[PDB]
Structure 1
Amino acid sequence: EAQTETCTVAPRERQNCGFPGVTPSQCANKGCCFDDTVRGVPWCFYPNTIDVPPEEECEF
């Protein structure tokens, strides 16, 4: 298996993982992927990214 889905799941279908005000640090506290790019929906949710490569890259 290679690169697959991601933590960017359907905002409406995103399985909440905490509170709406959750943050990158707050969420991680539980262990989920953050995404406050959409209001009304929870920022802390469960992701779905599958791959065999490393678990760290770069995005600057």
Structure 2
Amino acid sequence: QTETCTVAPRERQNCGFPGVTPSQCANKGCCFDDTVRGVPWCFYPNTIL
């Protein structure tokens, strides 16, 4: 792996859309988390090393 879903919520950039599902987020190669408010559910991953 070269990408990680460990992103600070205030740094998460929107990768999806209103009502995006994990499957639609996985199709785009992005990360999903709806347990944090005020941030996009589907966001881009962070680069490692």
**TM-score of the pair, normalised by structure 2:** 0.67
Question: Which of the two has greater helix per residue?
Answer: 2
Task: For CA contacts below 8 A with separation 6 or more, give which structure has more relative contact order.
Answer: 2
**1:32 Cα offset (Å):** 0.4
**1:6 Cα offset (Å):** 2.9
Q: Which runs of 5+ in 1 are unaligned?
A: 51-59
Please, what is the CA RMSD of the aligned residues?
4.3
Seq. identity, %: 98
After TM superposition, the structure 1 stretch with the greater mean CA deviation from structure 2, 15-24 or 38-47, is 15-24
Q: List, as ranges, runs of 4+ consecutive aligned residues in structure 1 with deviation greater than 4 Å.
A: none
Question: Which of the two has greater strand per residue?
Answer: 2
Equivalenced residues, count: 49
Larger Rg: 1 or 2?
Answer: 1
**1:33 Cα offset (Å):** 1.0
After TM superposition, the structure 1 stretch with the greater mean CA deviation from structure 2, 18-27 or 38-47, is 18-27
**TM-score of the pair, normalised by structure 1:** 0.59
CA contact (8 A) 1:8 1:35 kept: no
